[PDB]
């Protein structure tokens, strides 16, 4: 098919600023070239210009609600467009609060989408359950229909419309979930594979079940929101909220290779890469290199190798 | 249920001294608070006062037999008491020679106990098979009934009484077993899962089989003796006898999460943590943090999250 | 049985020179002693004297063809001899181009041999498909019968005779395969387990299938060509072409333990160990120690322990 790259240098969904450099370091890693180097048709819609909102005091506990609501709103429009151009949207973040706009925009063109959320967190806190007030830990609550009604009128998000059901999403990699978040998981019956299930079943069965769970009834567009902190910090240290005991480099590549093979990948998010938090220059390149590898895998790069339909001998 | 914490700052079961600091660094890591932070009822019986035995020459090859026999004897009494108070005994070590007293004391109140021994070693050498003479590598030989008769009259252990059968114990994590020790394993028919079986089956099946092996016939109290060197040294370097190729942080957490879910955990040992052997200050905190994580997992902390029986929305 | 050690200090199959020190650092690690320490009958045929070929300009793109062809030719003779002495040949390399001579020499005495190739690469490029021109990435092409006819008359290799069929070899560990190489894999129907299959099935099933694939029809001599870069570089960094996401120390030991248990190990190669490329002195010892461990495992050393047929009690 074809790809649609869109940079989202946004950080207001959380405290640390370095995350807005994500699009920059990833593009610098030669992402667009590496992709073209494969059988990929790439179109870059550029880095979105996120208007500065000086007047943005908290809503109760929630911080920078207008800036986050605006950035997600803009992204949504940008994603819907690339999708209306028949391309796989690739959002380079940026903090995870942007998923509100990415999945929202994506669902405008494909309302029957299925979401796979690779993360160490569920990011399903509501404005009233959150304790940090950071919006990169609440995106999923704004997207679920079952939750519509537990979400107050938060400045900046009146454009939002819950576009996914509790049963159109699967979490993979969870190892740090808050109490209120766990309650929602169990109460709404969300399908998830915490690190415990990954250890018990193995990443092969997990993927088998995940794809089976979302594509059993029928085939439909797949959206992959990949938070780099889903992988163990020994692979991706340059990120804001790292948690030990995460998915390995291999497991990260396995997940994406399996998604590509479905041929249903429709939208992709690579979030939470923060070059400023790398304890060393090598820690930064280690994070960017791994993030790039996962992305290339999403678009065909296989560990067993690739070859064009021709006779090489 | 409820917990009973007891510190065992003892090192004479082996050469390096730093191990007696175990209770200190673990408590400093905020273990008692973290536990209370969960649905845990914690009672600390304090650090046991281990009397100094100046006159303790070797028995043949065996070193500090009187000091080890005395410390294990005292611990046994302390454990039996906390158990008679209806609490899960948590012994903070200290070298592994203390397991003689811990399992002994535990079996006084619950003679039908089952033991799961996570270690890189089997610690089943006899005074006559040991080559090091260090008692932290012989505890299991003093506890088995099948071996009663191959154990000489060692100064300090005339109070001991073999309280477990060869079929009431399962080893997990073995990767450094002496020749004589292997002979005993095969001769007595002890159930074990070396690193080879873990690689072959996966930690999920291993736990399935372990719990099935010990709880098949009927449900009974479970005693977990956790040696931190069972985990690969990249996770727990601050320990006396580290061996490469050990259990991962994840596998360590998987084992303990599964044990908790049985609801049969009765006694727990966290041994061989030596702050003095950490090549760096980070190596020490890395070891203590991991040791604390395994402990919290033993008492309920789940990677998928936890929540109280209440409506969070 | 018995072992036949032969050092192959050769590097001309690739650019970096340090690799010729392989036999030296491995022997220095006390390999011969550690082996004898087991129930092993060891005979060292010494390090082969590789004649200097000053006049060796490229053949098209292929570099040092005469030196490589000569060294492999000599090795072949040396291996056939040790095999005619009823011993398991152990070739200490040296770059992987030597496998041409090792498998060739081995097949002279045992034409029905089966090959297990642990590597991050397939080393199956032909003189015409290679892009590097380095011969350590083409050995397999000179050995297959299905390919005989796609290989030009390369100076130094007129002594070669394809001795194995596409179905007498299994790859394990692949994660960096060129386009032309992938074409050959799929076209000839070669059985391989890339890192993707290892993640999907687990190393236990992979070995089950590998041994089943090569020994299903009937039992036959097994040749194991072990490239140290098959293992992740966190275990073997001192090597020329390291690739992230490789086999773990444990998986490396699992493969070799399973091969030993077959009792069919006939020939073994330990290649690509380059002491000069270790970023630190510890990186060098880490690589040599792991390489030695894999070797000892090939000859009986088990993680669950070993014991002689005698009563230890
Ligand atoms: N980076 C993330 N998620 O990906 N942060 C969310 C963090 C933790 C916590 N649950 C919160 O809402 O603050
Ligand atoms: N720390 C331990 N075990 O946990 N040490 C025992 C070590 C090795 C050897 N088996 C011995 O008896 O000396
Ligand atoms: N060390 C090895 N293999 O083990 N090098 C081969 C490398 C890469 C590439 N395929 C080539 O032919 O250059
Ligand atoms: Mn996230
Ligand atoms: Mn996260
Ligand atoms: Mn122990
Ligand atoms: Mn141990
Ligand atoms: Mn190779
Ligand atoms: Mn290689």
Instruction: Calculate how close chain A gets to B24, using CA atoms only, in Å.
Output: 24
Q: How far apart are alpha carbons A144 and A166 in whole angstroms? A: 6
**B196 and C303: CB-CB below 8 Å?**
yes
Residue in C32, C10, C230 with CA at minimum distance from that of residue C100: C10
Phi, psi angle pair for B242, to nearest 5°: -70, 145
Q: How many domains does chain A have?
A: 1
Ligand 1 pocket: which residues have CB below 6 Å? Answer: A 96, 119, 121, 123, 125, 130, 132, 134, 136-137, 178, 227, 229, 240-241, 272
Contact C71, C157 (CB under 8 A): no
C182 appears as a binding residue in the annotation: no
Q: CB-based contacts of A37: which residues, under 8 Å, 6+ apart?
A: none
**H or E element, residue A42:** strand A42-47
Residue B231 sits in a domain whose CATH number is 3.40.800.10
Contact C307, B186 (CB under 8 A): yes
Count of CA atoms in the C-beta half-sphere (13 A) of C61: 14
Handedness of CA A158, A161, A166, A170 (dihedral sign): negative
Q: Among all chains, which residue has been given the structure tokens 């811990």?
A: B102
State both tokens at A87: 């391309």
Q: E strands of C154-309, at which residues?
A: 169-172, 191-193, 222-227, 265-271
Backbone conformation region of residue C133, classed left if phi is above 0, alpha if psi is from -120 to 50, else beta: left
Resolution, angstroms, 1 dp: 2.0
Range of the domain at A123: 1-313
Q: CB-based contacts of C83: which residues, under 8 Å, 6+ apart?
A: C4, C89, C105, C106, C108, C109, C110, C266, C267
State both tokens at C128: 């015409």
Handedness of CA A214, A219, A223, A227 (dihedral sign): positive
| Separation of CA C184 from chain center | 20
Instruction: Calculate how close chain C gets to B215, using CA atoms only, in Å.
Output: 24
State both tokens at A309: 């339909």
Is residue B246 lining ligand 2, measured as CB closer than 6 Å?
no
Which residues of C are tagged catalytic?
Answer: 96, 119, 121, 123, 136, 227, 229, 272
Q: How far apart are alpha carbons B292 and B299 in whole angstroms? A: 11
Nearest to A150 among B254, B304, B313 (CB): B313
Ligand 3 atom with the smallest distance to the CA of C125 is 12
Q: At CB < 8 Å, which residues of chain C contact A?
A: 122, 126, 129, 150, 174-187, 192, 194-202, 244-245
Count of CA atoms in the C-beta half-sphere (13 A) of B53: 18
Angle at B121 between CA B120 and CA B125, to 5 degrees: 175
State both tokens at C39: 């129930």
Strand pairing category for B114-118 and B88-92? unpaired
Instruction: Give the residue ranges of DSSP H helices in chain B.
Output: 22-28, 31-36, 65-83, 99-109, 139-143, 179-188, 195-201, 203-215, 249-262, 281-298
């Amino acid at each position: 098919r074809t790809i649609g790259i869109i940079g989202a240098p946004f950080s207001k969904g959380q405290p640390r600023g370095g995350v807005e450099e994500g699009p920059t370091v990833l593009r610098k890693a030669g992402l667009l070239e590496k992709l073209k180097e494969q059988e990929c048709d790439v179109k870059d819609y550029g880095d979105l210009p996120f208007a500065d909102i000086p007047n943005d005091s908290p809503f109760q506990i929630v911080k920078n609600p207008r800036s986050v609501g605006k950035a997600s709103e803009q992204l949504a429009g940008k994603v819907a467009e690339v999708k209306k151009n028949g391309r796989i949207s690739l959002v380079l973040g940026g903090d995870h609060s942007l998923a509100i706009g990415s999945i929202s925009g994506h669902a405008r063109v494909h309302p029957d989408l299925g979401v796979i959320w690779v993360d160490a967190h569920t990011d399903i806190n509501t404005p009233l359950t959150t304790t940090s007030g950071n919006l990169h830990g609440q995106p999923v609550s704004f997207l679920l229909k079952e939750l519509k009604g537990k979400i107050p009128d938060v400045p900046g998000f009146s454009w939002v419309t819950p576009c996914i059901s509790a049963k159109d999403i699967v979490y993979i990699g969870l190892r740090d979930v808050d109490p209120g978040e766990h309650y929602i998981l169990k109460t709404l019956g969300i399908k998830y594979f915490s690190m415990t299930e990954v250890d018990r079943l193995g990443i092969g069965k997990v993927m088998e079940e995940t794809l089976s769970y979302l594509l059993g009834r029928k085939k439909r567009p797949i959206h992959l929101s990949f938070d780099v902190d889903g992988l163990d910090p020994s692979f991706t240290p340059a990120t804001g909220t790292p948690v030990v005991g995460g998915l390995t480099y291999r497991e990260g590549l396995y997940i994406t290779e399996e998604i590509y093979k479905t041929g249903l990948l429709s939208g992709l998010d690579i979030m939470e890469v923060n070059p400023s938090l790398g304890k060393t220059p090598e820690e930064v390149t280690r994070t960017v290199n791994t993030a790039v590898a996962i992305t290339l895998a999403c678009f065909g790069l296989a560990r067993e190798g690739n070859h064009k339909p021709i006779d090489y001998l």
